[PDB]
Amino acid sequence: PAQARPTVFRWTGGGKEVYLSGSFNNWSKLPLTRDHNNFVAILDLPEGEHQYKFFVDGQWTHDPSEPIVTSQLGTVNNIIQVKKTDFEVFDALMVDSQQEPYVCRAPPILPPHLLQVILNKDTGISCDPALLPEPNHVMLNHLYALSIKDGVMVLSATHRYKKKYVTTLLYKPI
Amino acid sequence: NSVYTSFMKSHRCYDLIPTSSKLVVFDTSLQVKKAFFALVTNGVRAAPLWDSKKQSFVGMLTITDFINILHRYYKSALVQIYELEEHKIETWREVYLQDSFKPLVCISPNASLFDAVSSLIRNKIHRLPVIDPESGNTLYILTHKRILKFLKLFITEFPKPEFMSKSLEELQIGTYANIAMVRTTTPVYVALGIFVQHRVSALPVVDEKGRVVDIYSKFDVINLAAEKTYNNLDVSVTKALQHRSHYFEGVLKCYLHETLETIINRLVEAEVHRLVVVDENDVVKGIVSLSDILQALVLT
Amino acid sequence: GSVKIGHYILGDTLGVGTFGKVKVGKHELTGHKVAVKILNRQKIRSLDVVGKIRREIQNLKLFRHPHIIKLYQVISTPSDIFMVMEYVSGGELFDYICKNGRLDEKESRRLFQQILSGVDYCHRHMVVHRDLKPENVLLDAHMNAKIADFGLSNMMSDGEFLRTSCGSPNYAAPEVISGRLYAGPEVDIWSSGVILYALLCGTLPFDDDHVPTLFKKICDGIFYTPQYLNPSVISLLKHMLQVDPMKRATIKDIREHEWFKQDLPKYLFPETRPHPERVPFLVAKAKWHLGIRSQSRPNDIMAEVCRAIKQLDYEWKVVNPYYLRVRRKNPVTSTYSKMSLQLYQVDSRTYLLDFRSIDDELTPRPGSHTIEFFEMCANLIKILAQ
Ligand SMILES: Cc1ccc(Oc2nc3cc(-c4ccc5c(ccn5C)c4)c(Cl)cc3[nH]2)cc1C(=O)NO
Ligand SMILES: Nc1ncnc2c1ncn2[C@@H]1O[C@H](COP(=O)(O)O)[C@@H](O)[C@H]1O
Numbered sequence: 095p096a097q098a099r100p101t102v103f104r105w106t107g108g109g110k111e112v113y114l115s116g117s118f119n120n121w122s123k124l125p126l127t128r129d130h131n132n133f134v135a136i137l138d139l140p141e142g143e144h145q146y147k148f149f150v151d152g153q154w155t156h157d158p159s160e161p162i163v164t165s166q167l168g169t170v171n172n173i174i175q176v177k178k179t180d181f182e183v184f185d186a187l188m189v190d191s192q193q194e195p196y197v198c199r200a201p202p203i204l205p206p207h208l209l210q211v212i213l214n215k216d217t218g219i220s221c222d223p224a225l226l227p228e229p230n231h232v233m234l235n236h237l238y239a240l241s242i243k244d245g246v247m248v249l250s251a252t253h254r255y256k257k258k259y260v261t262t263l264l265y266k267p268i
Numbered sequence: 269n270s271v272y273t274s275f276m277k278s279h280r281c282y283d284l285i286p287t288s289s290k291l292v293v294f295d296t297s298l299q300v301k302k303a304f305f306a307l308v309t310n311g312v313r314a315a316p317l318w319d320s321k322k323q324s325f326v327g328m329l330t331i332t333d334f335i336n337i338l339h340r341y342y343k344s345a346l347v348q349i350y351e352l353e354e355h356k357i358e359t360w361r362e363v364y365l366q367d368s369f370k371p372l373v374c375i376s377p378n379a380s381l382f383d384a385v386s387s388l389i390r391n392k393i394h395r396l397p398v399i400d401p402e403s404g405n406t407l408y409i410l411t412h413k414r415i416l417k418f419l420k421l422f423i424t425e426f427p428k429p430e431f432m433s434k435s436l437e438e439l440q441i442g443t444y445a446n447i448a449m450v451r452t453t454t455p456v457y458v459a460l461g462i463f464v465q466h467r468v469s470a471l472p473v474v475d476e477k478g479r480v481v482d483i484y485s486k487f488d489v490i491n492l493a494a495e496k497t498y499n500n501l502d503v504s505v506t507k508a509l510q511h512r513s514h515y516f517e518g519v520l521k522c523y524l525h526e527t528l529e530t531i532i533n534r535l536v537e538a539e540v541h542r543l544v545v546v547d548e549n550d551v552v553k554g555i556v557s558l559s560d561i562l563q564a565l566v567l568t
Numbered sequence: 569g570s571v572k573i574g575h576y577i578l579g580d581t582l583g584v585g586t587f588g589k590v591k592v593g594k595h596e597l598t599g600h601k602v603a604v605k606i607l608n609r610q611k612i613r614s615l616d617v618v619g620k621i622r623r624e625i626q627n628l629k630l631f632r633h634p635h636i637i638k639l640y641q642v643i644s645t646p647s648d649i650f651m652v653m654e655y656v657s658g659g660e661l662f663d664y665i666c667k668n669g670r671l672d673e674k675e676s677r678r679l680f681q682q683i684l685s686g687v688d689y690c691h692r693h694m695v696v697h698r699d700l701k702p703e704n705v706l707l708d709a710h711m712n713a714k715i716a717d718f719g720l721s722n723m724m725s726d727g728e729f730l731r732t733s734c735g736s737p738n739y740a741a742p743e744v745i746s747g748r749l750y751a752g753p754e755v756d757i758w759s760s761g762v763i764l765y766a767l768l769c770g771t772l773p774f775d776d777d778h779v780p781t782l783f784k785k786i787c788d789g790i791f792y793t794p795q796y797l798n799p800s801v802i803s804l805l806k807h808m809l810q811v812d813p814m815k816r817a818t819i820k821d822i823r824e825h826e827w828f829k830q831d832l833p834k835y836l837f838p839e840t841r842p843h844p845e846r847v848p849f850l851v852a853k854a855k856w857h858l859g860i861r862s863q864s865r866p867n868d869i870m871a872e873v874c875r876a877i878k879q880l881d882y883e884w885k886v887v888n889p890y891y892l893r894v895r896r897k898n899p900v901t902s903t904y905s906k907m908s909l910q911l912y913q914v915d916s917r918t919y920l921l922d923f924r925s926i927d928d929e930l931t932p933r934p935g936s937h938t939i940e941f942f943e944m945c946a947n948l949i950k951i952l953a954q
Contacts (some may be wrong), residue, residue, distance in 0.1 A: 100573060102647045125569045135569045141582045149926045164660065180646040183625065190609055191618040191710055194883040194895055198874055201866050201890045204912035205729055205749045206814050208922070211856045223311025223846045226288040231750040235727035237923035238856045238944050242953065246302055251925060254726060255400060259288040260407055265306055266295045268950050311846050323900040326790045355605040370793065405938045492845065495854035515842070539844050
């Protein structure tokens with residue numbers, strides 16, 4: 095249940111015979127499957143500390159790239175810490191992933207998507223003048239405007255509330 | 269409860285908002301002549317008013333405000349209406365609203381249709397702005413016509429209560445006394461004055477014998493801004509209504525013996541606000557509006 | 569001690585995807601086969617894709633479609649992430665066409681309908697594959713298309729473009745090999761158009777050993793049409809393969825096309841009098857434009873904007889020479905208004921500044937987010953026009 099959590103043990107290198115010994119199997123020799131220089135077993139381990147070592151073509155060795163621990167007897171083993179946040183997918187992706195005040199190439203070519211203006215589009219004479227076409231998602235929140243005239247500026251932008259769209263016009267003196 | 273009252277309690281204001289729609293907002297510092305011209309340009313009969321000073325939506329600018337300005341400041345066709353051209357939406361709102369201070373209140377999209385219909389009746393308004401409380405953005409202007417067209421599409425499928433088969437006379441829906449109306453020769457300015465005094469949606473245009481030959485509504489008034497004829501109000505309402513006589517539809521009516529269902533079907537099919545109740549000779553007995561019917565349906 | 573993950577015994581390698589390695593697996597009890605994508609956590613740290621991998625999982629986990637490869641489970645281990653996916657035995661569509669040649673009209677149409685249904689389903693869910701090609705189209709035992717390898721995909725966001733030249737050159741849209749901005753469905757459609765050509769002709773429409781010649785063919789939008797091709801499906805290909813993305817077919821256009829409609833299964837797709845309101849206006853029209861334009865030099869106009877933002881006492885973070893993010897404190901509500909700015913090019917002389925509203929994840933706030941955006945922009949526009 096919570097005591098069976100899959101842990102990958104992988105040896106990278108060549109070999110005829112590669113084994114895995116650890117505190118979890120009583121340092122018995124567990125054969126690893128070979129996949130073109132990659133040797134692997136997957137084991138369900140309890141949450142906690144475990145120590146392990148590899149037997150590679152007759153040589154007892156740890157994995158230098160993984161964490162190790164040295165005893166007072168001069169024994170060097172690999173060590174692994176099984177944590178719950180390793181098995182919760184989004185907890186693992188969270189721990190894996192680890193100004194504005196003014197201090198002061200060529201410009202991107204304008205996408206033609208933005209030149210389709212929802213208010214220039216003609217609506218049928220038989221329909222409510224307030225009704226509009228359904229906008230491309232890419233033009234939402236963009237500011238469109240009318241050339242300022244009679245000292246009045248006209249601004250508009252299309253926004254999206256739930257499954258509905260609302261194009262808002264604003265008349266401002268400027 | 270009834271078939272209609274429970275229906276309006278169920279649905280949310282959001283259910284009536286079009287997939288994609290246009291909303292016009294005026295800053296209150298905008299010149300009020302420009303604002304009415306903008307309403308015509310956008311095909312919109314009322315718009316939210318935004319105050320930059322108070323950073324809040326204040327109220328609605330409607331065609332009624334255009335009618336009030338005309339009647340109040342119109343002098344004659346020989347002199348411009350100075351206040352109409354010079355005033356700002358805020359300046360006139362202060363003069364007009366100085367006597368009575370009322371704070372416009374928006375309806376949340378998550379509120380029901382029973383809330384909306386109740387708010388329209390309680391405040392005696394035809395324009396209810398739907399505003400999202402989270403963002404603070406005004407979403408959609410909700411009207412009697414929008415709500416009744418929604419009910420027509422949805423309730424026709426289901427069983428309807430006995431109240432719908434009752435005649436207009438039995439239910440007593442509409443105003444049958446003190447009907448504000450004008451004559452074919454009545455000047456526009458006079459008709460505007462009646463709008464101001466009685467606060468009615470429209471005025472039946474009657475002949476010598478009281479037989480309705482046409483109707484002059486508040487909506488029709490906005491055509492003065494469309495053609496920029498607002499500076500001459502001396503003409504008769506008949507001359508004012510010549511603009512729509514090109515494709516003329518005989519003024520719509522209904523009788524007291526007809527059922528509420530028959531009447532609502534005629535309203536939604538024609539997409540009109542009210543019907544003139546008449547007798548055998550087309551003489552005006554009363555008026556049945558959308559607000560009358562939506563009050564009848566919201567009460568058991 | 570065979571390799572086993574969640575009762576599935578891992579077998580031979582099926583292939584290597586965009587990120588990570590994919591091996592077959594077989595249930596120790598039922599014998600059910602799965603495809604297992606293996607993502608080494610240290611490797612997705614090296615390449616900084618951890619966010620891409622997280623979004624891929626979040627969105628693809630909800631997908632259920634006949635013609636998209638299903639993601640059954642994601643198993644996280646201390647060293648590795650195992651994405652357990654449905655397995656199909658037919659292998660690649662590419663290999664199928666290699667061995668059997670072109671497919672006849674009816675079989676090409678059937679497979680194309682299946683694929684396009686999946687491409688549509690993705691777009692409805694705001695996902696864009698961008699690697700579409702016969703190599704990533706998988707067949708099951710019954711010859712049903714299955715889309716896979718979302719490694720190069722991305723997510724569509726309101727008001728946002730995507731600039732990342734992706735996918736094999738032969739299946740890439742002209743704007744993608746040109747390194748321009750795109751909404752992203754128009755690219756998947758171009759790719760789907762090439763897939764359709766490959767099914768019908770057994771070859772590729774844009775291919776050459778000289779890479780400049782290939783890119784010219786793509787940007788010219790010119791390809792050979794075999795005499796045996798149905799004129800109806802030729803018009804379909806021409807519309808899907810438009811160089812101009814604004815003239816290029818949409819999925820709506822393809823569903824309405826007569827060749828596509830023929831024999832289309834239903835499961836694939838889930839679906840006089842003047843108006844009274846518009847009467848006063850008729851009895852009685854300005855053209856809108858985007859942002860603000862200038863024929864001045866891009867160095868001059870980008871400097872002016874920085875100056876004007878400072879004049880208005882606004883706080884701004886610089887991203888690109890042509891990209892700015894601006895914040896304003898509301899003098900009444902004491903909350904913040906956020907908007908982003910980008911300079912584009914229109915023609916040789918003309919350049920354009922674009923204003924885009926930045927949404928807030930904040931608690932209910934006073935005032936109107938929409939209007940405050942407008943007011944903020946107007947202040948700057950006034951200065952820039954003066
Ligand atoms: C280059 C590279 C190096 C290392 C890497 O990380 C991992 N490779 C792995 C292989 C295996 C694995 C799976 C099945 C096996 C073997 C043996 C027999 N069989 C039947 C090894 C496992 Cl259970 C975990 C792994 N994590 C991933 C990559 C990579 O990104 N693609 O190669
Ligand atoms: N011309 C009119 N004369 C008198 N009452 C009216 C007239 N038009 C509408 N009403 C009444 O005014 C109320 C509001 O309706 P309305 O103004 O049409 O929304 C209802 O009670 C109507 O019956």
